[PDB]
RNA sequence: UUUUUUUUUUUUUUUUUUUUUUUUUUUUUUUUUUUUUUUUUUUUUUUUUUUUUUUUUUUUUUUUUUUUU
């Protein structure tokens, strides 16, 4: 048995370590392209990582959607605003994929300072689940993401994971209900409609048990 | 591991404090532009904050919609009416974003005086939930908003947060049902219709469990 | 990359401010020519702007067509009638282009006094949309127009914009149906006809959804 | 397998980069001919690009039709008016093709300053879609156009693309309804008619879903 | 009786905005109209399913009063 029919024997399992890569997280080729754009717009390379952690922490208070307006300037750039840092990222990967890379860093930072995501109440989270009230919360246990050196202070509880999956259903289905099913945006197909659906037909509910 | 691949070590989590910024709350650049317009229409800078807190407290009795008619004059301007203060705000940010900034102030003010939002019964709130009967109630636990020095008297209960989310569904869906799906307001698309929908097709219900 | 192939870098977007100019609004060269004619027919230069705002406010009660008869004299001229002020304007630009320049001023003036355009019922407007019942209502959000210092009291609602676009369809199509398609007004082409069309063939309808 | 039957192997896909060219965007031969005319009418070559970006930004407030009257003079020429710059462009390519080349620049400029196209309300756009209210908005994601160095602040949303396609239908069909089907402009064919169509037969509607 | 295989499990989409006011009266509730006739036959095949056509251009301005009931 050779070629693709080779049977592994036990030397492979004890020695080989798979480097984990994920397509929901910004790749190593993605992150090298961010650095080349960021250093060309004069982000200091001595605080390049802290400018990323500050941007993703701000992206836990607001969304990580491509339409999200970043607000202010962090203290680790040379006055480069967070909107300009995020616009450089969206040329390479999505903002959500970049934020998934730093999700354990932001999770530890929020749990150290006891500072939840800012709009947890507007998102409909209960106060006992408010630390899961950011998108890209799925990346906190993804091994392709940046894990801090001493690990997570606290893993996410099962109730926090439950609340995040429910909120992910509500936010994504509401965003799809504001979109359409039109396969083309030409007026021959859309007939000048945004959703192609009335207000009552677009109401999202999670059906009861 | 350097650049964007730097692993945080624990010095960062104990020292760095993220200044919280939110795009649902009026920004610091927004508020500086309000002050320049307000002092030019001769609002006293010694009571500039109290004129804002009086306007947002009045915006808890009426809406914070852009179409809302402000009624009277507060005691902290130099006779500048609340409609003129709100019209200056709507040149910079939304009125709702300005009111979200002062939501914990208005929440403490209403709980101190035992004075709920004025039209809580018309909004369909039960009497035990009537203190949540304002829009921009989501901002009372947003850390980007102005928190008073000694804190909230009482946090919002879970039942108050439940009632506010339900009322937010009813008021927003009713406002969308009076709007249309028309992608253009030209008569070639609207065909001279406001909603493009009959009265029976526009009825909003929250489907039962 | 130089010449017309130069890539903008971010210094341009933060520093350069485009002065907005519109060809639907009376230009700065247009308005300087109005002043030279108005001061030569002895309009007081101390109330030159108020004579314009009074004329455009009167042009919200009647049309801004070139055929419109202006009625009376405002209080800010030296007894110069509004028909003589409008005849001087029509030598330079259209009356509608002049009125578009002052559309936010007239919009604020009408909303302050609760005084809608005078013939809103004859125009077929519903009472809840009657403040949009003037032509040149499109200019109220045009940034080339004169914006008052503290801003609009209320922006136009979506239903008001819908009603204005529908009324613009009806009034313009009815005016075209009283015109012709004749490419020349010589009797060899027109054959002594005004519209070249019967009464039944000239009926305007907005086709139903 | 050689000649036109050669099978690509994977070296071609990893190495070759196609330079994108579009016939809806002004070509590199087009732009070199603009520069030769612009420098001969003494446009400064140190601000040749900024004079183009100022002209296209003004062409987002007014149209990019060949019949469009440009209004004023930008600050980056040596007093050369925008009408003279546009007349030089129309000798080489269309004004719309030139403006498509700088559509991401104008898109970033408008989103930085929060300054929409000036006549968005007259075009029938809803306020939530008003940043798409220019023609040549199709060029903002065309890779043949000039992309700024740090990228777009925000990509166009799906609802903005929907509104632009609907407005493109309405404006182009209305312009065709004012034209004719006559195959020749000689009076033997046109019979002295502009459209060859009555007013009621020329009404444009987008048929309802 | 037949129907129980395979395929389909990735990404993307989670921001903002929208929550005011107005609209809640009156009128409209009778009578008439309910039968008969019409239900069959015929018509179910063949042929027609390829290519071609998808670019560009066209999106500004002007026209919205009065009169006519």
Question: What is the SS3 assignment for chain D?
Answer: CCHHHCCCCCHHHHHCCCCCCCCCCCCHHHHHHHHHHHHHCCCCHHHHHHHHHHHHHHHHHCCCCCCCCCCCCCCCCCCCCHHHHHHHHCCCCCHHHHHHHCHHHHHHHHHHHCCCCCCCCCCCCCHHHHHHCCCCHHHHCCCCCCCCCCCCCCCCCHHHHHHHHHHHHHHHHHHHHCCCCCCCCCHHHHCCCCCCCCCHHHCCCCCCC
b/e code B129-144 from CB counts within 10 Å (16+ = b): bbbbbbbbbbbbbbbb
CA distance C64 to C25: 13
Report the alpha-carbon distance of residue C57 to residue C43 in Å, rounded: 18
Q: How far apart are the first and last CA of chain B?
A: 52
Q: Which chains touch A (3 or more CB pairs under 8 A)?
A: B, D
Distance CA A98, CA A95 (A): 5
Contacts of D123 in chain B (CB under 8 A): 186
DSSP code, position C20 = P
For residue B24, give the nearest of B141, B125, B117 by alpha carbon: B141
CA angle D83, D89, D94 (to 5 degrees): 110
Residue C11: count of CB within 10 angstroms of its CB? 9
- Residue C193, classed as helix, strand or coil, is coil
For B13, name the nearest residue in chain A, comparing CA atoms only.
A109
The answer to whether C143 and C156 have CB atoms below 8 angstroms apart is no
Q: Is the dihedral of CA B35, B36, B39, B41 positive or negative?
A: negative
**Is the distance from CB of B101 to CB of B26 less than 8 angstroms?**
yes
* Residues B77 and B63: beta-carbon distance below 8 Å: no
What is the nearest nucleotide to A174, using C1' and CA?
A: E14
What does the block give as tokens for A201? 């037909």
d(CA A96, CA B171): 31
Contact between residue B107 and residue B140 where contact means Cβ atoms under 8 Å apart:
yes
How long, in residues, is chain A?
209
For strand E, which residues in window 2-21 of chain D come within 7 Å by CB? none
* b/e burial code for range A105-133 (CB count within 10 A of at least 16 → b): bbbbbbbeeebbbbbbbbbbbeeebbbbb
Interchain contact C182–D (C-beta under 8 A): yes
- In angstroms, the CA C131 to CA C118 distance is 10
Separation between Cα atoms, residue A137 and residue A106, nearest integer Å: 9
Q: Residue D58 in contact with residue C23, Cβ under 8 Å? A: no
CB atoms within 10 A of CB D175: 11
CB contact, 8 Å: D129 with chain C?
Answer: no
Q: Is the CB of D160 under 7 A from strand E?
A: no
**CA atoms of C168 and B187, how far apart (whole Å):** 9
Residue C138: which of C70, C64, C62 has the closest Cα?
Answer: C64
Instruction: Assess contact for D70 and D81: CB atoms under 8 A.
Output: yes
Please work out, in degrees rounded to the nearest 5, the angle formed at the alpha carbon of residue B174 by the alpha carbons of B169 and B176: 95
Contact B18, A117 (CB under 8 A): no
Q: Give the integer Cα–Cα distance in Å for A138 and A165.
A: 9
User: In sequence order, what are the residues at sequence separation of 6 or more whose Cβ sits closer than 8 angstroms to the Cβ of residue D89?
Assistant: D34, D95, D98
Q: How far is CA D60 from the centre of its chain?
A: 9
How far apart are the C-alpha atoms of C172 and C178, rounded to whole Å?
10
A190 touches strand E (CB under 7 A): no
Q: Are A98 and A66 in contact (CB under 8 A)?
A: no
Separation CA D109–CA C12 (nearest Å): 8
Per-position DSSP letters for A145-206, written without gaps between them: S---TT--SSPPPHHHHHHHHHHHHHHHHHHHHTS---SS-SHHHHSS-SSSS-TGGG----
Query: What is the token pair recorded at C169?
Result: 């369809």
Residues of D in contact with B189 (CB under 8 A): 124, 166, 170, 205-206
Instruction: Look up tokens 């693309």; give the residue.
Output: D161
**How many Å is the maximal CA-CA distance in chain A?**
64
Kindly give the interhelix angle for C48-61 and C82-89, rounded to the nearest 10 degrees.
Answer: 100
Spatial distance between the Cα atoms of C108 and C146, rounded to a whole number of angstroms: 11
The answer to whether strand E lies under 7 Å from the CB of residue C176 is yes
Closest CA to C64 of C85, C48, C41: C85
Residue (of C130, C132, C48, C58) closest to C99 by Cα position: C58
Q: Residue B49 and residue B40: Cα distance in Å, rounded?
A: 16
Minimum CA–C1' distance nucleotide for A171:
E14
| C124 interfaces chain B, CB cutoff of 8 Å | no
| Annotated domain spans of chain B | 1-209
* Residues D208, B196: C-beta atoms closer than 8 Å: yes
CB contacts of A67 in chain B (<8 Å) are: none
Two tokens, residue D207:
């048929």
3-state percent helix, strand, coil for chain C, nearest multiple of 5: 50, 0, 50
Nearest one of C7, C29, A198 to B201, comparing CA atoms: A198
B90 in contact with chain C, both atoms CB, cutoff 8 A: yes
Chain centroid to Cα B29, Å, comes to 18
Contact B159, C173 (CB under 8 A): no
- A76 in helix, strand or coil? coil
**Residue B74 DSSP label:** -
Given CA atoms A158, A162, A167, A172 in this order, what sign does their dihedral have? positive
Is B66 within 8 Å of C155 when comparing Cβ atoms? yes
3-class SS string, B130-176? HHHCCCCHHHHCCCCCCCCCCCCCCCCCHHHHHHHHHHHHHHHHHHH
Do residues C52 and C64 lie in contact, with contact meaning Cβ atoms separated by under 8 Å? no
Distance from CA of B20 to the nearest CA of A (A): 7
Beta-carbon contacts of residue A8 (< 8 Å; ≥ 6 apart): none
How close B72 comes to chain D (CA, Å)?
Answer: 29
* Burial of A27 (C-beta count, 10 Å sphere; 0-12/13-18/19+): middle
Instruction: Give D183 CA → E47 C1' in Å.
Output: 39
As a whole number of Å, the CA-based R_g of chain A is 21
Q: Which of A91, A186, A196 sits opposite D151 (nearest CB)?
A: A91
For tokens 């390379």, what's the residue?
A45
Is the Cβ atom of C66 within 7 Å of strand E at any atom? yes
Within 7 Å of a protein beta carbon, the nucleotides of strand E are: 10-22, 55-66
Structure token digits, residue A90: 């969206």
Protein CA at C184 to nucleotide C1' at E10, angstroms: 66
Using an 8 Å Cβ cutoff, are C165 and D121 in contact?
no
CA neighbours closer than 13 Å in the CB half-sphere of residue A126: 11
Q: Does an H or E element contain A33, and which?
A: helix A28-40
Where on the phi/psi map is residue C116: left (φ > 0), alpha (ψ -120 to 50), or beta? Answer: beta
CA of C172 to C1' of E59 (A): 19
CA dist., res. D203 & res. D181, Å (int): 16
- Among the listed residues C70, C69, C80, the one whose alpha carbon sits nearest the alpha carbon of residue C47: C80
Residues 85-124 of chain C sitting with CB below 7 angstroms of strand E: 94-97, 119, 122
Q: Which candidate, D90, D112, A98, A165, places its Cα nearest to that of C15?
A: D112
- For residue D208, the chain A residues in CB contact (below 8 A) are 191
Question: Which single residue is written with the structure tokens 């809806």?
Answer: D24
Set of chain D residues whose Cβ sits within 8 Å of the Cβ of B187: 205
Structure-token match 């048995």, residue found: A1
Token readout for D78 is 């040596």
Cβ neighbors of A91 (< 8 A, separation 6 or more) are: A37, D150, D151, D152
> Which residues in chain A are contacts of B162 at CB distance < 8 A?
none
- Residue ranges of D 62-81 with Cβ closer than 8 A to chain C: 62, 68-69, 71-72
Question: Are residues A134 and A117 in contact, defined by beta-carbon separation less than 8 angstroms?
Answer: yes
3-state secondary structure of B88: helix
C192 in helix, strand or coil? Answer: coil
List of residues 6+ apart from C203 with CB closer than 8 A: C177, D200
Give the orientation angle of helix C48-61 with respect to helix C28-40, to 10 degrees: 100
Tell me if D129 sits within 8 A of D72, measured CB to CB. no
Mark yes or no for CB contact B176/A199 under 8 Å. yes
Sign of the alpha-carbon torsion through A139, A143, A146, A149: positive
Q: Is A150 on the interface with B (CB under 8 A)?
A: yes
Say if CB D136 and CB D146 are below 8 A apart: no
CA distances from B16 to A152, B4, D119 (A): 17, 18, 47
CA distance C152 to B83: 10
Interface residue D193 vs chain A (CB under 8 A): no
Residue A76: HSE in the Cβ half-sphere, 13 Å Cα cutoff = 23
D194 interfacial to chain C (CB closer than 8 Å): yes
Query: How many Cα atoms sit within 13 Å of B91 on the Cβ side?
Result: 21
Please give the radius of gyration of chain B, using alpha carbons only, rounded to the nearest integer.
Answer: 21
Round to whole Å and give the CA distance between C46 and C44.
5
Q: How far apart are CA A79 and CA A73, in angstroms?
A: 6
Task: Please tell me whether any atom of strand E lies within 7 Å of the Cβ of C21.
Answer: no
Question: Distance (Å, rounded) from C-alpha D92 to C-alpha D100?
Answer: 15
Sequence-distant (≥ 6) Cβ neighbours of residue D10 within 8 angstroms: none
Strand E near-CB residues (< 7 Å), B 149-188? 167-168, 171-172, 174-176, 178-179
CA–CA dist B123, B4 (Å, integer): 50
C180 touches strand E (CB under 7 A): no
Q: Is A36 exposed, middle or buried (0-12, 13-18, 19+ CB in 10 A)?
A: exposed
For residue A50, what are the contacts with CB-CB under 8 A and spacing of at least 6?
Answer: A74, A76, B12, B16
Experimentally, the structure was elucidated by cryo-EM
Neighbors of chain D with 3 or more C-beta pairs under 8 Å: A, B, C
Report the alpha-carbon distance of residue D102 to residue D144 in Å, rounded: 10
Alpha-carbon distance values, C120 to A128, B191, C134, C135 (Å): 56, 20, 8, 11
Interface of C with D in 30-59 (CB under 8 A): none
Q: Are B116 and B66 in contact (CB under 8 A)?
A: no
Answer yes or no: do A88 and D151 touch at CB < 8 A.
Answer: yes
């Amino acid at each position: 048995a050779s070629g693709l029919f080779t049977i592994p024997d036990g030397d492979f399992f004890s020695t080989a370590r798979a480097i984990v890569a994920s397509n929901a997280v910004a790749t190593n080729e993605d992150l090298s392209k961010i650095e080349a754009i960021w250093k060309d717009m004069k982000v200091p390379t001595d605080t390049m990582a802290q400018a990323a952690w500050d941007l993703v922490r701000h992206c836990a208070d607001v969304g990580s959607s491509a339409q999200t307006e970043m607000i202010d300037t962090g203290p680790y750039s040379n006055g480069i605003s967070r909107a300009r840092l995020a616009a450089a990222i969206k040329e390479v990967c999505t903002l959500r994929q970049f934020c998934m890379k730093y999700a354990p860093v932001v999770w530890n930072w929020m749990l150290t300072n006891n500072s939840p995501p800012a709009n947890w109440q507007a998102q409909g989270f209960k106060p006992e689940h408010k630390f899961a009230a950011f998108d890209f919360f799925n990346g906190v246990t993804n091994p392709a993401a940046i894990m801090p050196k001493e690990g997570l202070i606290r893993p996410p509880s099962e109730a926090e994971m439950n609340a995040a999956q429910t909120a992910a259903f509500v936010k994504i289905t509401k965003a799809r209900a504001q979109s359409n099913d039109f396969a083309s945006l030409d007026a021959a197909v859309t007939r000048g409609r945004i959703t192609g659906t009335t207000t009552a037909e677009a109401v999202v509910t999670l059906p009861p048990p």
